Amino acid sequence: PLHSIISSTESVQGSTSKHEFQAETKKLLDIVARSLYSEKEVFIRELISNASDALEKLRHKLVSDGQALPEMEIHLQTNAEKGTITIQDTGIGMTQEELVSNFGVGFYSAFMVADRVEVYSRSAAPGSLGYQWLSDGSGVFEIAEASGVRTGTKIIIHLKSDCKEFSSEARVRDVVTKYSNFVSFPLYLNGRRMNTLQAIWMMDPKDVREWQHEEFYRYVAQAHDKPRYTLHYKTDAPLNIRSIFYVPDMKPSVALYSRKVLIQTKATDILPKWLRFIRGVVDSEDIPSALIRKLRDVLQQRLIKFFIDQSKKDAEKYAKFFEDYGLFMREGIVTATEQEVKEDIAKLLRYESSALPSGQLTSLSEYASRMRAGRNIYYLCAPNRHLAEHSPYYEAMKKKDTEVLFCFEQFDELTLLHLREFDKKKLISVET
Numbered sequence: 001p002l003h004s005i006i007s008s009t010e011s012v013q014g015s016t017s018k019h020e021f022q023a024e025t026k027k028l029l030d031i032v033a034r035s036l037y038s039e040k041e042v043f044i045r046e047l048i049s050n051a052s053d054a055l056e057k058l059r060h061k062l063v064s065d066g067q068a069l070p071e072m073e074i075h076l077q078t079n080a081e082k083g084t085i086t087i088q089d090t091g092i093g094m095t096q097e098e099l100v101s102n103f104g105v106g107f108y109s110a111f112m113v114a115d116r117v118e119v120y121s122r123s124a125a126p127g128s129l130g131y132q133w134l135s136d137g138s139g140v141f142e143i144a145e146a147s148g149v150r151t152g153t154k155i156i157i158h159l160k161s162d163c164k165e166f167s168s169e170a171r172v173r174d175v176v177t178k179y180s181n182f183v184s185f186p187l188y189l190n191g192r193r194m195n196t197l198q199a200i201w202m203m204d205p206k207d208v209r210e211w212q213h214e215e216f217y218r219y220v221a222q223a224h225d226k227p228r229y230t231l232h233y234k235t236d237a238p239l240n241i242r243s244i245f246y247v248p249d250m251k252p253s254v255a256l257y258s259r260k261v262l263i264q265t266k267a268t269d270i271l272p273k274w275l276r277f278i279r280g281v282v283d284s285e286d287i288p289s290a291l292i293r294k295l296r297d298v299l300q301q302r303l304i305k306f307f308i309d310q311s312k313k314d315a316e317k318y319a320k321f322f323e324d325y326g327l328f329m330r331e332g333i334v335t336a337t338e339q340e341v342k343e344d345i346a347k348l349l350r351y352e353s354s355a356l357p358s359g360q361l362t363s364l365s366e367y368a369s370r371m372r373a374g375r376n377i378y379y380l381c382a383p384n385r386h387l388a389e390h391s392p393y394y395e396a397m398k399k400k401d402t403e404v405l406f407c408f409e410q411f412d413e414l415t416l417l418h419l420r421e422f423d424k425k426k427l428i429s430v431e432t
C-alpha cells in the first residue's frame with residue numbers, strides 16, 4: 001500500500017507582494033547556483049537535510065512541551081509530465097518573518113537545477129498562517145498568504161529543460177540511497193520507503209551493541225566478516241567528530257559524512273595512507289582536499305593511542321593484528337617525516353627479545369625499563385630465534401647485562417634502521 005502525503009491543497013486568494021533580493025543574499029545565491037557544488041544532484045541531499053532539521057526541532061519542541069507527536073516524515077515526489085520534483089516535510093515551518101528574511105543556505109542549491117521554485121510553508125506555532133513563496137533565480141521573489149498549507153514545508157522544483165533527469169523516479173532513488181540512507185526521519189519517494197539504515201555513529205558508544213556494529217561494518221566495508229577491532233570516537237572538544245573505525249577479521253574505504261549525510265564515499269585523505277586498511281565512517285560538521293589535515297592528524301593520534309590501549313589489554317590478539325597489518329605500520333613509519341610521528345607509529349611495533357620466551361613480544365617503549373639510564377637500543381634482526389639466541393654478536397651482549405631485540409625478516413630491520421632513534425635514543429644492531 002502506497003503512503004503519500006503530497007497533494008495540491010494549496011490556494012492563493014490575494015496577490016503576491018514582490019520582493020527584491022538584497023545585495024549580499026543575491027550574490028551568494030548566484031554562487032550557490034553555479035559555483036559552490038560540483039555535482040548537480042546534491043540539491044536533493046541539502047533539501048532533505050533541511051527537512052531533517054525542521055522535523056528535529058518540531059520533535060524537540062513537542063517533546064519539551066510534552067505534547068503528542070504527529071507524523072514526522074519526509075516525502076519526495078517526481079512528476080515527469082509537469083517536469084517537477086517536490087520535497088515536503090511535516091516538520092516545524094517558517095514564519096512570514098523567516099520567509100521574508102531567509103543551515104539554511106543549502107536551499108538555494110535548488111536553483112542549480114531549477115528554472116522556477118514554488119514553496120509553501122506553515123509554521124508549527126499555534127494559529128499560524130501558511131504562505132506561498134515564488135522565485136525564478138532572479139533578484140526577485142514573490143510572497144503571498146496561502147491556504148491549504150499543511151504544517152511544515154513544501155518545496156516544488158520546476159526543472160530546467162536539461163536538468164529534467166531529476167524528474168525520474170530511478171535517478172532520484174539512486175541519489176537518495178547514495179546520500180541520505182541514514183536520515184533520522186522516515187523518507188518516502190512516491191510513496192515508497194527508502195532509508196532503513198541507522199547512523200549508529202551518532203549514538204552514545206555505550207548504547208551500540210555488536211550486532212549493530214557488525215551490520216554497519218558489513219555495510220561500509222562491503223564485507224561479510226566481522227570487525228576484529230572497533231573504535232567509537234566522539235569529540236566536541238578541539239573539533240566535532242563522530243566516527244567509527246573497524247579492523248576486519250580478514251587479512252588484506254572510510255566514508256566521509258557530515259550531519260548524517262554523505263559527502264565522500266571513498267574519502268581517501270581523511271586518514272594517513274598507512275591507515276587505509278581501517279574501515280568505517282567519519283562524521284564532522286566542518287566539511288564543505290585542501291585542508292582536511294588537522295582532522296587526519298587527530299584521527300591518527302587517537303587511532304594510534306587506540307591500538308596501544310588494545311596492546312595493553314589483550315596481547316595475543318594485538319600480536320595477530322601486528323602480524324596481519326604490521327606491514328602498513330612499517331610502511332607508514334618509513335613514509336613519515338617528523339621523528340615523533342615515526343616514533344608514534346613505532347609505538348605500535350612488536351618484536352621478540354632476549355629476556356622474553358620465544359613468541360613473547362614487546363614494544364620499543366616497554367622493556368626499555370630494565371634498561372639502566374645512560375643509553376641505547378640494540379637489536380639483531382636475524383633469520384631465527386635459535387640462530388640469534390646462539391649468535392656470536394649477541395653473546396657479546398648476553399652477560400654485559402643488556403637486552404637485545406630479535407627481527408627475523410629484512411623489512412623489520414630496514415624499518416628499525418630508518419627509525420634510527422626512538423625517544424631521543426638511538427637504535428643500532430649488535431652487528432656493529
Ligand SMILES: Nc1ncnc2c1nc(Sc1cc3c(cc1I)OCO3)n2CCCCCC[PH](c1ccccc1)(c1ccccc1)c1ccccc1
Pocket residue numbers: 050051054089091092093094097098099101102103104105106107119133152153
Ligand atoms: N524545510 C524547512 N523547514 C523549515 N525551515 C527551513 C526549511 N528549509 C530552510 S532553508 C531556506 C528555505 C527557504 C528560504 C530560505 C532558506 I535559508 O526561502 C524560501 O524557502 N529553512 C530555513 C530555516 C533555517 C534558517 C533559520 C531562520 P533564523 C532568522 C533570523 C532572523 C530573522 C528571521 C529568521 C532563526 C530564528 C530563530 C531561531 C533560530 C534561527 C537565522 C539564524 C541564523 C542565521 C540566519 C537566519
